Design a protein around this ligand. Sequence first.
Ligand SMILES: C[C@H]1CN(C(=O)Cn2cccn2)CCO1
Length: 149
Amino acid sequence: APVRSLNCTLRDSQQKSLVMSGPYELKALHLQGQDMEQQVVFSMSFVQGEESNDKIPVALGLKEKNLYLSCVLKDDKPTLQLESVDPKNYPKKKMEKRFVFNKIEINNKLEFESAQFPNWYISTSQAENMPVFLGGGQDITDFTMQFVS
Ligand SMILES: C[C@H]1CN(C(=O)Cn2cccn2)CCO1
């Protein structure tokens, strides 16, 4: 039947929140109190793909927006982008591979591996207000999820 989706927020293992800074642009920063309304709410879709006990294929769309995180080669490197889609056709169970992350449960945290680019992860910097990026050292790949109404 329809693809199944949950509303959620993500925080990195230094408890940095993710926000839409600019057009098609994600950064991460320490947020608490009133300013937490600025955080991005995801619609996490459970999509078709290779699955195991602790490795579950998802897509990450922005809640009630036709925008998905997407892994594509840019100037010859796997990168993370926000990509616009046809709002009539999404979300769907058979998401294209560039939209698919393997959500991996390791030591009570989550990592989001690119299905398209093995061993490349959704990452943040230790520094405040820096972009969210694909990284596959010195990066944060460990998140926690908060389930939203
Ligand atoms: C969703 C990400 C997209 N960002 C990029 O920098 C993409 N990019 C990397 C190398 C070249 N382009 C900014 C932060 O939010």
